[PDB]
Design an enzyme around this catalytic site. Structure first.
Site, PDB file in Angstrom:
ATOM      1  N   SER A  11       5.174  -8.183   0.802  1.00 34.41           N
ATOM      2  CA  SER A  11       3.841  -7.581   0.769  1.00 34.41           C
ATOM      3  C   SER A  11       3.669  -6.660  -0.434  1.00 34.41           C
ATOM      4  O   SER A  11       3.223  -5.515  -0.287  1.00 34.41           O
ATOM      5  CB  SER A  11       3.581  -6.797   2.055  1.00 34.41           C
ATOM      6  OG  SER A  11       4.724  -6.001   2.346  1.00 34.41           O
ATOM      7  N   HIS A  16      -4.134   1.080   0.858  1.00 39.71           N
ATOM      8  CA  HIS A  16      -5.017   0.003   0.423  1.00 39.71           C
ATOM      9  C   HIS A  16      -6.314  -0.062   1.206  1.00 39.71           C
ATOM     10  O   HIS A  16      -7.167  -0.904   0.890  1.00 39.71           O
ATOM     11  CB  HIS A  16      -4.310  -1.338   0.564  1.00 39.71           C
ATOM     12  CG  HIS A  16      -3.804  -1.582   1.947  1.00 39.71           C
ATOM     13  ND1 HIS A  16      -2.652  -0.998   2.429  1.00 39.71           N
ATOM     14  CD2 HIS A  16      -4.319  -2.303   2.968  1.00 39.71           C
ATOM     15  CE1 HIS A  16      -2.468  -1.369   3.682  1.00 39.71           C
ATOM     16  NE2 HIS A  16      -3.460  -2.166   4.030  1.00 39.71           N
ATOM     17  N   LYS A  36       8.229   3.380  -1.642  1.00 40.77           N
ATOM     18  CA  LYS A  36       8.057   2.333  -2.642  1.00 40.77           C
ATOM     19  C   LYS A  36       7.223   2.873  -3.802  1.00 40.77           C
ATOM     20  O   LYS A  36       6.486   3.847  -3.656  1.00 40.77           O
ATOM     21  CB  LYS A  36       7.390   1.101  -2.019  1.00 40.77           C
ATOM     22  CG  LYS A  36       8.240   0.401  -0.966  1.00 40.77           C
ATOM     23  CD  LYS A  36       9.384  -0.353  -1.620  1.00 40.77           C
ATOM     24  CE  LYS A  36      10.031  -1.342  -0.658  1.00 40.77           C
ATOM     25  NZ  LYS A  36      11.278  -0.780  -0.046  1.00 40.77           N
ATOM     26  N   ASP A  42      -2.669   4.288  -3.212  1.00 40.11           N
ATOM     27  CA  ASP A  42      -1.774   5.436  -3.344  1.00 40.11           C
ATOM     28  C   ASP A  42      -0.541   5.149  -4.193  1.00 40.11           C
ATOM     29  O   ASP A  42       0.319   6.026  -4.329  1.00 40.11           O
ATOM     30  CB  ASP A  42      -1.358   5.975  -1.970  1.00 40.11           C
ATOM     31  CG  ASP A  42      -0.524   4.985  -1.182  1.00 40.11           C
ATOM     32  OD1 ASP A  42      -0.731   3.778  -1.355  1.00 40.11           O
ATOM     33  OD2 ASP A  42       0.355   5.408  -0.407  1.00 40.11           O
ATOM     34  N   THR A  49      10.665  -5.306   9.032  1.00 38.19           N
ATOM     35  CA  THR A  49       9.572  -4.621   8.354  1.00 38.19           C
ATOM     36  C   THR A  49       9.600  -3.132   8.682  1.00 38.19           C
ATOM     37  O   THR A  49       9.718  -2.745   9.852  1.00 38.19           O
ATOM     38  CB  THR A  49       8.234  -5.226   8.826  1.00 38.19           C
ATOM     39  OG1 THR A  49       8.174  -6.630   8.520  1.00 38.19           O
ATOM     40  CG2 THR A  49       7.071  -4.513   8.191  1.00 38.19           C
ATOM     41  N   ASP A  98       2.059   2.764  -4.035  1.00 34.25           N
ATOM     42  CA  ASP A  98       3.375   2.262  -3.668  1.00 34.25           C
ATOM     43  C   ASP A  98       3.457   0.737  -3.622  1.00 34.25           C
ATOM     44  O   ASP A  98       4.550   0.202  -3.405  1.00 34.25           O
ATOM     45  CB  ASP A  98       3.849   2.899  -2.358  1.00 34.25           C
ATOM     46  CG  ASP A  98       3.115   2.389  -1.158  1.00 34.25           C
ATOM     47  OD1 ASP A  98       1.959   1.953  -1.326  1.00 34.25           O
ATOM     48  OD2 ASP A  98       3.693   2.464  -0.051  1.00 34.25           O
ATOM     49  N   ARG A  99       2.365   0.022  -3.894  1.00 27.15           N
ATOM     50  CA  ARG A  99       2.385  -1.436  -3.994  1.00 27.15           C
ATOM     51  C   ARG A  99       2.037  -1.890  -5.412  1.00 27.15           C
ATOM     52  O   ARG A  99       1.339  -1.190  -6.154  1.00 27.15           O
ATOM     53  CB  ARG A  99       1.419  -2.060  -2.984  1.00 27.15           C
ATOM     54  CG  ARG A  99       2.092  -2.346  -1.626  1.00 27.15           C
ATOM     55  CD  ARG A  99       1.183  -2.112  -0.427  1.00 27.15           C
ATOM     56  NE  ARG A  99       0.135  -3.120  -0.278  1.00 27.15           N
ATOM     57  CZ  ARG A  99      -0.256  -3.613   0.895  1.00 27.15           C
ATOM     58  NH1 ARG A  99       0.325  -3.195   2.015  1.00 27.15           N
ATOM     59  NH2 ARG A  99      -1.220  -4.524   0.955  1.00 27.15           N
ATOM     60  N   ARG A 124      -4.689   7.114  10.512  1.00 25.20           N
ATOM     61  CA  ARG A 124      -5.803   6.549   9.763  1.00 25.20           C
ATOM     62  C   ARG A 124      -6.990   6.350  10.694  1.00 25.20           C
ATOM     63  O   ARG A 124      -6.880   5.663  11.713  1.00 25.20           O
ATOM     64  CB  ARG A 124      -5.423   5.222   9.107  1.00 25.20           C
ATOM     65  CG  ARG A 124      -6.600   4.554   8.409  1.00 25.20           C
ATOM     66  CD  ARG A 124      -6.197   3.261   7.711  1.00 25.20           C
ATOM     67  NE  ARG A 124      -5.769   2.238   8.656  1.00 25.20           N
ATOM     68  CZ  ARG A 124      -6.604   1.496   9.372  1.00 25.20           C
ATOM     69  NH1 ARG A 124      -7.912   1.672   9.257  1.00 25.20           N
ATOM     70  NH2 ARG A 124      -6.133   0.583  10.210  1.00 25.20           N
ATOM     71  N   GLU A 151       9.716  -6.147  -0.718  1.00 21.42           N
ATOM     72  CA  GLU A 151       9.015  -6.681   0.435  1.00 21.42           C
ATOM     73  C   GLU A 151       8.015  -7.682  -0.098  1.00 21.42           C
ATOM     74  O   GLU A 151       7.396  -7.435  -1.145  1.00 21.42           O
ATOM     75  CB  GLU A 151       8.274  -5.594   1.228  1.00 21.42           C
ATOM     76  CG  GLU A 151       9.136  -4.694   2.088  1.00 21.42           C
ATOM     77  CD  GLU A 151       8.382  -3.464   2.589  1.00 21.42           C
ATOM     78  OE1 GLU A 151       7.462  -2.986   1.883  1.00 21.42           O
ATOM     79  OE2 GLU A 151       8.710  -2.984   3.694  1.00 21.42           O
TER      80      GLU A 151
END
Ligand SMILES: [Mg+2]
Length: 560
Positions: A380, A120, A391, A292, A359, A294-295, A25, A378
């Site tokens: 988060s 995110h 996820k 993306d 984690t 996954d959360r 990133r 998780e």
């Protein structure tokens, strides 16, 4: 033209192209202003594929829609073709959610995928860009592979490219490219962004029950916020078009290159629009996704906040509302160590294994690949299952809808019933951002020394009407039962005899994360404000750590 030349381009290596666990990133401006930055990295990824295996290989390619994604996808196609990769499968317009990439990789038995997402993190001309490599089990490339990519990237002196090759990303089907002086063509298949993932969900969940739940006069009223990110078209095509939710159920569901100018990160303040909508009382269920996909954040009527630690526990306690788990059975439960102990109470009561991992994805993936992990969470905002090897936020939403359908209760009533049955784990995470590294490290080292003392177990801590006794105190370590690896220094844990915990973790400015988990067995005290119930343990945590004295911080930067 679809008859293109292969060319070798001299390049100069960069020294910071470290893939990490979630991909490389960098600021978008870095990719654009650093000659061959992207090209060098793509080449480095592809150079880990044995030449002999490239022609029969497929890479799945797609991303979250952020600015620069399509230019990067074109680059990937030009370099993959020149390197003898036989095929790319690319989502239409370049769009694939991270769970969709994992789904497709595993479905078509691809060697891996390259995901153009920074999750995110903000996107746009002035935002971030990420390049993430997943391997053949559908999950993140592990350290041995990312190490190789980094090592290749640091000494790369040339890369191979078809500079005239152009993929039409808007158009479904096969595009064939014939490479000059190459026998086998290069093939790009553009697939619908949603189909393969929707088809997987159609098999996992009872779409007939969900259609009935979401349509008609007595429908469950939902608001699903994709935060202008990749999950947008998935919500529209699955929840609205297929399952019959009205179109206004899909909030911020048009992917935007800048995510609307905001961070696509689901929490009560980044998704404050969704929260304000939910506060009006018209809707039964809300959720928000990250860039993306996954959360996920789960909301109830009036904006009732389901802590992610509770969310995985509620799913575990009602897991056979989901047809997938009726069929596979429950192979095991897992949570990251800082996540609250709510999941443990369900696992203990139902006699299912509970794996407490550091984690990171690799620990869950290992357990899933051993057929020992069905459901993970998780704190988060992460929830998933072994249906894939990432996820999956939209999956977590359809899990909740399935539970809502069989339970026939409000989200809040489901939680109240849950807390009445298992007790409540009041939970919060304090983030102290950009603290001076020397102080934060001194804080951790001093606290670790204090906890290591023979007399620290059994010490008692009081605040107001609360006495906590130290049962165990350590620096969390995990021996992975699959790859044998030993992960050390994964977090300072203060474990109390009553089921409560304090955890300290450290993660360009250090971040302290302080997780507080207060177990409350008294039915009278369930559904209270967590911040009120956690205040005694917060006071104990700040005092034993001397955090304010070591950092100069009187308050966390963010409270979740
Ligand atoms: Mg993400």
């Amino acid at each position: 033209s679809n008859m293109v030349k292969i060319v070798t381009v001299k390049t100069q290596a960069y020294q910071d192209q470290k893939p990490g666990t979630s991909g490389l990133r960098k600021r978008v401006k870095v990719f654009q202003s650093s000659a061959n930055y992207a090209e060098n990295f793509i080449q480095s990824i592809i150079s880990t594929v044995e030449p002999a295996q490239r022609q029969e290989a497929t890479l799945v390619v797609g991303g979250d829609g952020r600015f620069y994604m399509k230019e990067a996808i074109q680059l990937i196609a030009r370099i993959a073709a020149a390197n003898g990769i036989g095929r790319l499968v690319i989502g239409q317009n370049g769009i694939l959610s991270t769970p969709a990439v994992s789904c497709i990789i595993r479905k078509i038995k691809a060697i891996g995928g390259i995901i153009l997402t920074a999750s995110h993190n903000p996107g746009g001309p002035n935002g971030d860009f990420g390049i993430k490599f997943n391997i053949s089990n559908g999950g993140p490339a592990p350290e041995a592979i990312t190490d190789k990519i980094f090592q290749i990237s640091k000494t790369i002196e040339e890369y191979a490219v078809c500079p005239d090759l152009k993929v039409d990303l808007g158009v479904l089907g096969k595009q064939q490219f014939d490479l000059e002086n190459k026998f086998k063509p290069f093939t790009v298949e553009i697939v619908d962004s949603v189909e393969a993932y929707a088809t997987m969900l159609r098999s996992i969940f009872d779409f007939s029950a969900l259609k009935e739940l979401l349509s008609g006069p007595n429908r469950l009223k939902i608001r699903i916020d994709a935060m202008h990110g990749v999950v947008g078209p998935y919500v529209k095509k699955i929840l609205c078009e297929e399952l019959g939710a009205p179109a206004n159920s899909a909030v911020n569901c048009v992917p935007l290159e800048d995510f609307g100018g905001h961070h696509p990160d689901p929490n009560l303040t980044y998704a404050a629009d969704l929260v304000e909508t939910m506060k009006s009382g018209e809707h039964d269920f809300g959720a928000a996704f990250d860039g993306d996909g996954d959360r996920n954040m789960i909301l109830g009527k009036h904006g009732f906040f389901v802590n992610p630690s509770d969310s995985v526990a509620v799913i575990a306690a009602n897991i056979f509302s989901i047809p997938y788990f009726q069929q596979t059975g429950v192979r095991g439960f897992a949570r990251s160590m800082p996540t609250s102990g709510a999941l443990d109470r369900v696992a203990s009561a139902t006699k299912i294994a509970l794996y407490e991992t550091p984690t990171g994805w690799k620990f869950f993936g290992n357990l899933m690949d051993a057929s020992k992990l069905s459901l993970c969470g998780e704190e988060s905002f992460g929830t998933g299952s072994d249906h894939i090897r990432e996820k999956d936020g939209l999956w977590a939403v359809l899990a909740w809808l399935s539970i809502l359908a069989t339970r026939k209760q409000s989200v809040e009533d489901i939680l109240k019933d849950h807390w009445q049955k298992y007790g409540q784990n009041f939970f919060t995470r304090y983030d102290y951002e950009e603290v001076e590294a020397e102080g934060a490290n001194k804080m951790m080292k001093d606290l670790e020394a204090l906890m290591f003392d023979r007399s620290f177990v059994g010490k008692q801590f009081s605040a107001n009407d609360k006495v906590y006794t130290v049962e165990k105190a350590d620096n969390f370590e995990y021996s992975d039962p699959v790859d044998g690896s030993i992960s050390r220094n994964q977090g300072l844990r203060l474990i109390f005899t009553d089921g409560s915990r304090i955890v300290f973790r450290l993660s360009a400015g250090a971040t302290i994360r302080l997780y507080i988990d207060s177990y409350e067995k008294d039915v009278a005290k369930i559904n209270q404000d967590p911040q009120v119930m956690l205040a005694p343990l917060i006071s104990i945590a700040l005092k034993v750590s001397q955090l304010q004295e070591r950092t100069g911080r009187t308050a966390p930067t963010v409270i979740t």
